[PDB]
Amino acid sequence: RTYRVGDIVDIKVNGAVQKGMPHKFYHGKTGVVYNVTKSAVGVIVYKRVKHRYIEKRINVRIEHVKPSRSREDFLRRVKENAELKKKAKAEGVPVQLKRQPAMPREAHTVSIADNKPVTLAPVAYE
């Protein structure tokens, strides 16, 4: 795997390699890149103390850093929000582009037929 300076990488920290292992406070956290070396990769990652954020700079080898799929939903969204807007302006019709947070369900009717509702009860200890 190859890595740029400025992209988003995520650390996994497997147990196979023990050389220069980050702490358990650094396992499984995502950050950005500022240096790329022969083996180690310079990672900038924020840290949560009290009420604020402080930035720490580290070096992790290529054995545990993977490309981040964090902004994958963005590049899908802007591409799709583009081409629907082309289809909207061509057809002259409006389209809802933003995300709706899944409103509660509306009313409907459930028929009895072919489904006689079974009567249940709790069971004894035996």
Partner 1 sequence: MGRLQEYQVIGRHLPTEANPNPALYRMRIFAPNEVVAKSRFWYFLRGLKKVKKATGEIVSVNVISEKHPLKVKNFGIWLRYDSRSGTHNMYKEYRETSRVAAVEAMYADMAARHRARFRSIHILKVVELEKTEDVKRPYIKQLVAKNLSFPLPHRVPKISTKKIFSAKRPSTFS
Partner 2 sequence: VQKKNPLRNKQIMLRLNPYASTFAKEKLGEVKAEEGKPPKVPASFKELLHEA
Partner 3 sequence: IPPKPRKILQLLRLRQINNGVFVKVTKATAEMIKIVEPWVAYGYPNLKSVRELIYKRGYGKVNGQRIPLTDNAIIEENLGKYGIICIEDLIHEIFTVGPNFKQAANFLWPFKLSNPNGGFRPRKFKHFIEGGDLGNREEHINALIRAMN
Partner RNA sequence: ACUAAUCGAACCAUCUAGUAGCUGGUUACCGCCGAAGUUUCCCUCAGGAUAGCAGUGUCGACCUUCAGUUUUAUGAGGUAAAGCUUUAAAUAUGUAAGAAGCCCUUGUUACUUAACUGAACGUGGGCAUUCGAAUGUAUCGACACUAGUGGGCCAUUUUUGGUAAGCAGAACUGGCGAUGCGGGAUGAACCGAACGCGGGGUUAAGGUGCCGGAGUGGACGCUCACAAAAGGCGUUAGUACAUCUUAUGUACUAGCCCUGGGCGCUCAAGCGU
Q: Is 71 helix (H, G, I), strand (E, B) or coil?
A: coil
What residues numbered 60-119 form the site for partner 1, per CB under 8 A?
A: 105, 110, 114-119
Q: Which of 1, 23, 38, 52 binds RNA (CB under 7 A)?
A: 52
Closest CA to 12 of 21, 3, 4: 21
100 binds RNA (CB under 7 A): yes
| CA dist 44 → 66, 67, 72, 102 (Å) | 15, 15, 20, 36
Q: Which of 104, 116, 121, 125 binds partner 3 (CB under 8 A)?
A: 104
Min. distance of Cβ 6 from RNA in angstroms? 6
d(C-alpha 42, C-alpha 26), whole Å: 13
Q: Which of 78, 103, 112, 118 binds partner 3 (CB under 8 A)?
A: 103
